[PDB]
Amino acid sequence: PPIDPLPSLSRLMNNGVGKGKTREDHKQVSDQLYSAYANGVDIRKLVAIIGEDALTENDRRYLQFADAFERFFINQGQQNRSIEESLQIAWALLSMLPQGELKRISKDHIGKYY
Amino acid sequence: SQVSPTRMNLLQRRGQLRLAQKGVDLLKKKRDALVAEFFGLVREAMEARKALDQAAKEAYAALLLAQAFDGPEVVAGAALGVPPLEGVEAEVENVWGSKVPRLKATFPDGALLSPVGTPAYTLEASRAFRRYAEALIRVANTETRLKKIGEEIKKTTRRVNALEQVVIPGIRAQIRFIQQVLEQREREDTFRLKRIKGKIEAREAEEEGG
């Protein structure tokens, strides 16, 4: 399915969700996925404008997250994913970003799933 | 704050599409020419470079422990140093891909003319200076050509990228916005005209009734 969340904006995102009302890290992994993709797609703008690049090495990791979120996650065919399977593996793509550069998720959750 | 008018703006925005699309068409094949020829210079560059790099060094490296006291002798017979302020011959040239200057490395340095010293090596080292000079001209033109073709490439990808986002659909949405508001205005026209009709008939319906 092609879903693009960047022009997407929902009314509630912490209501009907929270610790034990969905999963404890549902509430945490919300805002995280959002700003993470953002800073990927952003680069691909500026690359044409000057040279053939527009990135360092601290940009290059957010770069691969716009490929990672892509055909792995967004694509799935029509297969039914479970609320577990979703956020679980959403933390295997978040291993490619520095954990010391995360500011949209709390630290006590870093220690629960890495 | 700043919003576009409809009646005044219309005529500008229709010719906007005429101007843009045609301009960019030929802009396209403008740089294409220049990069095709550029391959030719980069390849050809290194031809002389492999040949003369090795035959320069041939003698150099074989005159290091027979030199360091025959250094004196070799520099004496030979033609004195190239000037540090413009010893090379700089050329200015205006060309597309901005005004980039070029240059050719030819200067005097002599050849086969140092008197006294090591029988073979001295003279062979002096001659070798030529194989710096000459060889260096190739890289003298391609590394300056590199900076020119940088400008082009970057501006090229810039315009394409840009066009498909802000410009093109934006120059569209302007006609569209205009259009729709011109169009919708003409609901009030018809509605008013309706009530006008109603009056007219109502008047000829007081001759024949009430």
Domain boundaries, chain B: 1-210
Of B40, B26, B116, the closest CA to residue B75 belongs to B116
Give the separation between CA B147 and CA B154, rounded to whole angstroms: 11
Enumerate residues 6+ apart whose C-beta is below 8 A from B46: B138
Contacts of B160 in chain A (CB under 8 A): 48
CB contact under 8 A, B161 and A50: no
Q: How far is A93 from chain B (nearest CA, A)?
A: 29
Distance CA A94, CA A68 (A): 9
Q: How far is Cα of residue B199 from the mean position of the Cα atoms in its chain?
A: 70
Kindly determine whether residue A52 and residue B160, on different chains, have CB atoms separated by under 8 Å.
no
Contact criterion met (CB below 8 Å) for B104 and B88? yes
Q: Does domain B1-210 have CATH number 1.10.287.3240?
A: yes
- What is each CA distance from B129 to A74, A109, B53, B81, B133, in whole angstroms? 64, 68, 11, 11, 7
DSSP B80: P
Structure token digits, residue A4? 């693009």
User: What tokens were used for B88?
Assistant: 């090379």
Q: How far is A64 from chain B (nearest CA, A)?
A: 21
Contact present, A91 and A29 (Cβ < 8 Å) = yes
CA B18 to chain centre: 25
CB of A7 less than 8 A from some CB of B:
no
Question: Is A46 part of the contact surface with chain B (CB cutoff 8 Å)?
Answer: no
CB contact under 8 Å between B153 and A49, yes or no, is no
Contact call for residues B171 and B4 (beta carbons, < 8 A): no
Experimental approach taken = cryo-EM
- Is B124 buried (19+), middle (13-18) or exposed (0-12) by CB count in 10 A? middle
Q: Please list the residues that pair with B91 across neighbouring strands.
A: B102
B-chain CB neighbours of A49 within 8 Å are 157-158, 161-162
- Residue among A42, A96, A55, A50 at smallest CA distance from A73: A96
The answer to whether B161 and A49 have CB atoms below 8 angstroms apart is yes
Burial of A89: CB neighbours in 10 Å, binned 0-12, 13-18, 19+: middle
CB contact under 8 A, B160 and A48: yes
B167 touches A: beta carbon within 8 Å: no
Number of CB atoms found within 10 A of residue A41's CB: 15
Two structure tokens written together for A15: 């209501």
DSSP reduced 3-state for B188: helix
Q: In this complex, is the C-beta atom of B4 within 8 Å of any C-beta atom belonging to chain A?
A: no
Residue B176 identity (one-letter amino acid)? R
CB atoms within 10 A of CB B203: 9
Phi then psi for residue B103, to 5 deg, are: 170, 160
Q: Which of B127, B112, B125, B131 is nearest to B66 (CA)?
A: B125
* A46 chain-B contacts, CB cut-off 8 A: none
